[PDB]
Amino acid sequence: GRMLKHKRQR
Amino acid sequence: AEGLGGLERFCSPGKGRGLRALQPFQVGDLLFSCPAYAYVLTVNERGNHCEYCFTRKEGLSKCGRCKQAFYCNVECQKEDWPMHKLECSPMVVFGENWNPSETVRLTARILAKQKIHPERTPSEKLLAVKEFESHLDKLDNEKKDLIQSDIAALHHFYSKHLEFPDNDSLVVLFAQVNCNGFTIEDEELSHLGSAIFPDVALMNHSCCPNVIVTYKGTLAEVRAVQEIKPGEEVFTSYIDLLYPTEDRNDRLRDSYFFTCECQECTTKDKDKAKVEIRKLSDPPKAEAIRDMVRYARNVIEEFRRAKHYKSPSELLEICELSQEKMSSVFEDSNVYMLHMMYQAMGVCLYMQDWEGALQYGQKIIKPYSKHYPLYSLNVASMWLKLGRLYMGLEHKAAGEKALKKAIAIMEVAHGKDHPYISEIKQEIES
Numbered sequence: 001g002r003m004l005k006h007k008r009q010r
Numbered sequence: 011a012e013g014l015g016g017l018e019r020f021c022s023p024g025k026g027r028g029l030r031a032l033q034p035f036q037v038g039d040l041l042f043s044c045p046a047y048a049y050v051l052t053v054n055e056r057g058n059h060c061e062y063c064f065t066r067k068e069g070l071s072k073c074g075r076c077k078q079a080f081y082c083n084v085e086c087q088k089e090d091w092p093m094h095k096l097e098c099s100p101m102v103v104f105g106e107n108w109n110p111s112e113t114v115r116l117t118a119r120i121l122a123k124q125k126i127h128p129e130r131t132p133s134e135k136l137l138a139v140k141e142f143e144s145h146l147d148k149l150d151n152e153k154k155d156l157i158q159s160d161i162a163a164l165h166h167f168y169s170k171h172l173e174f175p176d177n178d179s180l181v182v183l184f185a186q187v188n189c190n191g192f193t194i195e196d197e198e199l200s201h202l203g204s205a206i207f208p209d210v211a212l213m214n215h216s217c218c219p220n221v222i223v224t225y226k227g228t229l230a231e232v233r234a235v236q237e238i239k240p241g242e243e244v245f246t247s248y249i250d251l252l253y254p255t256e257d258r259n260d261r262l263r264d265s266y267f268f269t270c271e272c273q274e275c276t277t278k279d280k281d282k283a284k285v286e287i288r289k290l291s292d293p294p295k296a297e298a299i300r301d302m303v304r305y306a307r308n309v310i311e312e313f314r315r316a317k318h319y320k321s322p323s324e325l326l327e328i329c330e331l332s333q334e335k336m337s338s339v340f341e342d343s344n345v346y347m348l349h350m351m352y353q354a355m356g357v358c359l360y361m362q363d364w365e366g367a368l369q370y371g372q373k374i375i376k377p378y379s380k381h382y383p384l385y386s387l388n389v390a391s392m393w394l395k396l397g398r399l400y401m402g403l404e405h406k407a408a409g410e411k412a413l414k415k416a417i418a419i420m421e422v423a424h425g426k427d428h429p430y431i432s433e434i435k436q437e438i439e440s
């Protein structure tokens with residue numbers, strides 16, 4: 001995952 | 011004088027620092043706006059959005075040197091130059107060899123901004139970048155190796171135009187970027203880029219947030235999605251709210267180093283339906299369900315990696331397969347089924363199979379409205395996509411109904427005068 005603040009999981 | 015009207019920074023017990031409302035805010039009310047301290051457009055959207063202001067416009071004029079950066083006009087081209095200059099010459103120099111991660115690209119810009127504007131900017135009225143939380147003390151070996159790899163990439167790709175601090179300052183900076191950074195998504199939640207919004211970064215997380223962050227070009231905007239009373243803490247969501255409590259918390263613990271204790275995480279009310287199992291004669295034994303949950307969550311990561319090495323047909327096969335295996339235990343409304351249906355929809359959209367995507371979307375939409383909050387961009391974007399698909403396939407009635415369902419949420423989240431809304435209303439009148 002390792003994402004920044006997000007609404008949709010990429 | 012007050013830095014941000016009707017709000018104040020405070021110490022939120024158990025959550026470090028936070029943002030508090032001083033006055034009442036109602037649904038759709040704008041709490042505040044925050045210009046980007048630093049931001050970078052994703053490579054894939056180049057030529058579609060202006061590098062400076064993010065306006066999505068046709069016939070954008072490109073940069074003469076790198077021919078990679080596109081702009082509205084010369085003013086936007088010139089205004090962006092202090093930042094673009096960090097990549098312009100290098101993309102020419104390093105050809106296809108130039109693959110800095112987005113985060114590294116963002117951090118170079120932050121470093122640049124610190125150098126140009128050391129004083130507090132208008133984007134730092136309550137919280138400054140230098141103040142960002144880092145959790146350096148909680149970082150493990152792997153995360154640290156990853157940060158060093160990012161630092162190495164930054165040196166490799168940015169050394170001639172940017173002066174660097176000692177290694178520890180870079181470790182801290184990357185660590186702050188990791189827990190205070192944002193992604194900018196368009197009206198369909200498509201990834202546009204990454205940015206730093208310091209005042210927005212002050213708000214703590216909840217899985218049932220009372221505000222939504224949206225973007226107007228590169229301007230961050232914060233609007234209420236529930237009633238906010240004076241003295242109440244203001245909460246946004248850092249993550250995708252579709253998943254069950256454990257998943258959300260595994261991600262929050264993993265990326266932000268805290269376990270959420272909001273009502274949804276405490277009561278877990280949405281979990282039963284998110285993990286809906288189908289009603290059979292047997293029924294499924296608990297062990298098998300726990301096993302299907304592990305399988306589903308395993309396939310999520312397998313799928314996420316495979317986007318990089320597999321063809322669309324194959325990814326589709328993964329989705330059909332996974333759904334088939336999981337459907338032995340799981341009901342269609344279950345979020346793990348939905349993740350795969352959603353991904354499958356995305357593949358369909360990629361292979362231009364509009365009918366297939368529409369057939370998945372119609373199946374995805376209802377359970378989404380249940381799992382997500384009342385005003386959720388994840389739901390709105392879905393209604394929007396469904397609507398545009400209907401409109402494109404010449405089914406105007408359903409198109410209007412879906413666009414109206416999207417608009418009703420978007421008026422709250424983006425504000426009535428947002429250009430996206432005018433665009434969607436302008437799409438209906440055709």
Ligand SMILES: Nc1ncnc2c1ncn2[C@@H]1O[C@H](CSCC[C@H](N)C(=O)O)[C@@H](O)[C@H]1O
Nearest residue numbers: 024025026027143189211212214215266268
């Ligand atoms: N809901 C929550 N529960 C506990 N800690 C939270 C939280 N939401 C945010 N945090 C904390 O805040 C960080 C995100 S940046 C938010 C601002 C931060 N609290 C500060 O004082 O600067 C997280 O890494 C986490 O440690």
Ligand code: NI
Nearest residue numbers: 021022026027
């Ligand atoms: Ni404090």
Ligand code: NI
Nearest residue numbers: 217218274383
């Ligand atoms: Ni809720």
Ligand SMILES: [Zn+2]
Nearest residue numbers: 060063082086
């Ligand atoms: Zn522009």
Ligand SMILES: [Zn+2]
Nearest residue numbers: 073075076098
């Ligand atoms: Zn250039």
Ligand SMILES: [Zn+2]
Nearest residue numbers: 217270272275
């Ligand atoms: Zn929570």
